[PDB]
């Protein structure tokens, strides 16, 4: 499978959530949000957000709004 992490193309485990994608890529969170396929999902879902071959991702630093 392949993905786009912050405009960076990649190849990881298709079907693996984000918590699965990030962790597979060797990335965790520490306060990070991301947008896949242009849909910004809340970190928590990363653990149940199964990623698919062609997984596109956006990277946000810290959860800050306002």
UniProtKB/Swiss-Prot annotation:
Pathway: Cofactor biosynthesis; thiamine diphosphate biosynthesis. There is a cross-link at residue 66 (Glycyl cysteine dithioester (Gly-Cys) (interchain with C-184 in ThiF)). Keywords: Nucleotide-binding, Phosphoprotein, Thiamine biosynthesis, Thioester bond. One of its GO terms (biological process) is thiamine diphosphate biosynthetic process. The modification Glycyl adenylate is found at residue 66. The modification 1-thioglycine is found at residue 66. InterPro entries: Beta-grasp_dom_sf (IPR012675), Mopterin_synth/thiamin_S_b (IPR016155), Thi_S (IPR010035), ThiS/MoaD-like (IPR003749). One of its GO terms (molecular function) is sulfur carrier activity. C-terminal thiocarboxylation occurs in 2 steps, it is first acyl-adenylated (-COAMP) by ThiF, then thiocarboxylated (-COSH) by ThiI. Gene3D superfamilies: 3.10.20.30. It comes from the Bacteria. GO terms for cellular component: adenylyltransferase complex; sulfurtransferase complex. Is the sulfur donor in the synthesis of the thiazole phosphate moiety of thiamine phosphate. Belongs to the sulfur carrier protein ThiS family. This is Sulfur carrier protein ThiS. The gene is thiS.
